[PDB]
Every structure is written in structure tokens, then in C-alpha cells.
Amino acid sequence: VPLSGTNVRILADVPFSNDYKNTRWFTSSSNQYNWFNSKSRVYEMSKVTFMGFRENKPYVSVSLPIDKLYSASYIMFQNADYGNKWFYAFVTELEFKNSAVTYVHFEIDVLQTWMFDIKFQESFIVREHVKLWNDDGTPTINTIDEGLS
């Protein structure tokens, strides 16, 4: 995961977070890009460098006052050296450095970023959504004890 970016865009209104309880799943990267591309661009940069240096504090310097970046929720960017791949990241915290300069902290969204590179193998499934009705209108058989009154 890169530490210098191109085509960088800071987005507003991305409805999921680094709690990772929810995400928007996609059938293709093209669809994924289109979805993010319909989000409001709070700020854009053609070429930028990332710092931190220390683990867990990666960020990008933006030349706006911290009040102007409150809507920021997400970042997407490309790296010139690994083709047309998009990297996606949560905006986690705005750090006031100077006035008229904010440090925008981000954390790589591992789901969105690696969505089509992951291969799921056989796993213990605690819960999932299953087929409810057979073709003939009869219920499927699911009798695992739910332990609910």
C-alpha cells in the first residue's frame, strides 16, 4: 500500500466507517469506481506525498482550514507505479497544524481497497442469510437452535 498518490480525491458522504460493521459490496471494480465517483469531491490533488513515518498516523497535508474539511469522510487515490488501481481510505481525524493548513489523517479501507483480490475459503459460518423457499413453495429446512425465546 503506497505512500505517494496521484488523482487524489477527498470525498464527502461515505456512509460507512472503520468500525467495519457495514460496507457497500460491488460486483466489479468499474462499478466500485463509478459509485465513488458520484460522491462530492471536497478536495482534489494531482500529485501528493503521504507522511507518518510512525505507524497508524498516516496523513496528507491539505491547504484548507480545518472547518472547511469537516465534511471529509473518505479518500481515494491512485499510484503511478501500479497502474489504474484505486486505493480507498477512511478519513479518521483532522489535525490542526497551522491555520490554513490541515493534516488529514486516513486509514486504508481494507475491504474497499482489496475487494476483488480476496479469495474466501471454507470457514466456520456463525450466521448468514440463506435460501428461504424452495421452488415449489415449501420452506427450506433450517433448524439450528437459535436460543431465542
Partner: peptide, 10 residues
């Protein structure tokens, strides 16, 4: 949900 930084929303 809402228009809120996710930190406040959390």
C-alpha cells in the same frame, strides 16, 4: 445514519 463525521456518529 446521517450527515455527521463518523466519529460523532459512532
Amino acid at each position: 445514519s446521517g450527515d455527521i463525521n463518523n466519529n460523532d456518529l459512532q
